[model samples]
Target: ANFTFSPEEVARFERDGYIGPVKIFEPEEMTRRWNIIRRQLLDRSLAIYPDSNGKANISNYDRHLDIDLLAEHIMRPEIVDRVGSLIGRNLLCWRSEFFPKYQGDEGTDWHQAATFAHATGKPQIIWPSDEGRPAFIGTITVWTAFTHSTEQNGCLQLMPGTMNYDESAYPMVLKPGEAVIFWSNTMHASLPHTGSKTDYRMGFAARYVPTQVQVYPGTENLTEYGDGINLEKYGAVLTSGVDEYGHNRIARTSQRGYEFVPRQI
Candidate 1:
């Protein structure tokens, strides 16, 4: 199958909320490389935003802008190709964020992210719809396990085979370096880390939508979701294909001159 998801695999993705514990990096390599990226996170002089002291903790958003490894990580074919199969070829990475569940951190509340307005109050992404229909409901999300993800370390919990969370939700334990691809509207949450206090739970989530979508339309400054972030520094990255719509402010390179070099395919 060359790992391009078989039609059956795609159907199941549509049936369930997500698929995989798919391999991205091996354990030995993931551990070593994560150690480096972990240390580098401390130095964020070149991050997309200056500093976000707001309650929502958007401070850790979009580090890929400055980190070369993450820059390449978001564009990897293993991740992008599969998502492109579901969405269209013309896609843009609208956002990237870190999800860290440290010791004593509370389990995340059950939620879904159609338009990502669950917290923000403002629609973050708008998909086009027909005259009497609503816009495309959700974005496709690729969440990578940066550290070992387990019940003890608070791995993701999702409602598979059903859209209703209360019906059949289950834990999604992932090995380090594996990734789960899901619909953004999929109901999901996570339990708290019950492991040793020294152990940390970390995941990286990148959100994607086709290029035709308009992001944060009529939005400038946002105070929703407990964060008061100005949008002047925000822009989207075209992860694959073409952006003929010009709906987003696409950056050719990072703030530090790290090139994005969108995949032409």
Candidate 2:
């Protein structure tokens, strides 16, 4: 299950600030799983965040905390292994989000996030002052496509080798179950879904950070994107190695009985 990136791959990732169209699940399997997961989403009995009264997209956040399949998706070796190769062996999946694009939807504005304060006005992750810590201040984002993603259907776009904007951005088209990994601070966005009216795009992003990073430091609740959620039921999942720092709450299992086994390198 070790899918660690080769030296060349690692070098490319370091140079480009991103990598992949990597295969995670097969197309058929992803479709099968997505169908079930789609229905399961309607029942939020175990969701860590209580309903946000439809105030914003916050209600759809962190389904991995309750959805068994999603809990498994976040811990997949294909994702964790490569992410570990870039960051560190000890990892925590601090966040997961749903990015849905409906027909005729406009593209998201180009953005780079470090500390994720653009929306909340307060840093979501804080690195230790120790010199050993990573100097770059962002998480690794593994965004997976649950449905076919093409330029016409709002696929992800990235401007490689940058934390700034550029017109040379290119799209990362992906098939079902495929994914692209990038830095949270990378200049990125998605195109508008201009395909058939019946078609849509479904993307799931799992954000990871090294164990040494303190997530949501000194915060009891998260308020952003015009919505808010209490942090009492939330805990970051230790996806790889051990969290020796104990800087954040760690969830051992999903509410629906999905155990989160850390991937040891």
Candidate 3:
């Protein structure tokens, strides 16, 4: 609602390919919710993906499908509205991920993603072709800090105006409940977590694309990040407006029985 980006903010996002330090939840509230979510994350009884042997990340891919808190997080107006301002009103949150950096962990490699095929070697999303050529666009990602994200704790780094090519990246330090939105094709990475062994940084990233895009095009299973997952129960959640194109499976309700009521904006 009131969280929608102003015209100038939209222009800045378009020019720089990223925006924010936006507030999603208050710090104290986020801490309380994260405490509950951390516990719920341990119970994957209704998770869409089956346990992938010992590969933890792949199995925990889209917890929004089963975890009510995450389901709500993806649909929050503070995030969806801003993303819609850049992309379009008809939005689908196709994927959400947990980016945790613990002490002694290496920083993520600097990279850019368009079709998201780097890890899976297969296009996970396809845009409608314009004339004879397909649009070279990437999804909008809203990365929310679940814990304190500081320089010493592996905060995100981004090279502004580098969505097309690149430059030296600057760290985007954020507090709990704050988020940074950016293009998937933006050159980005993170710093190594050099904090105390007991301190860690956790970020939750929700990926959104317009409804006209095809997600997991013609695929029945997902094999990425060194693991695989069945697509039987996988579906995109309509986070905003109407999906008039029907390009992907739409989940009306989460596994935990939370209804996904799309934002009317």
lDDT of each: 0.77, 0.84, 0.83
Clashes of 1: 0
Model 3 per-residue lDDT tens digits across residues 10-115: 9988877798799999999999889999999999899987776733344367899999999999999989888988889899999988888889887787876665
Query: Sorted on TM-score, highest at the top, how do the candidates line up?
Result: 3, 2, 1
Question: Candidate 1's residue-wise lDDT over 173-232, tens digit each?
Answer: 888889999988888888888889988888988888899888776664442333544455
Higher-lDDT candidate among 1 and 3? 3
- Point out where model 1 deviates above 4 Å: 1-3, 55-59, 108-110, 117-120, 163-169, 220-228
Lowest-lDDT window of 10 residues in candidate 3? Answer: 220-229
Clashing pairs in 2: none
Off by over 4 Å in 3: 53-59, 117-120, 163-169, 220-226
- Assess every candidate by TM-score: 0.88, 0.90, 0.91
lDDT ranking, high to low: 2, 3, 1
* Clash pairs (backbone) in predicted model 3: none
Error of 1 at 130 (Å): 1.7
Off by over 4 Å in 2: 54-59, 114-119, 130-136, 163-169, 220-226
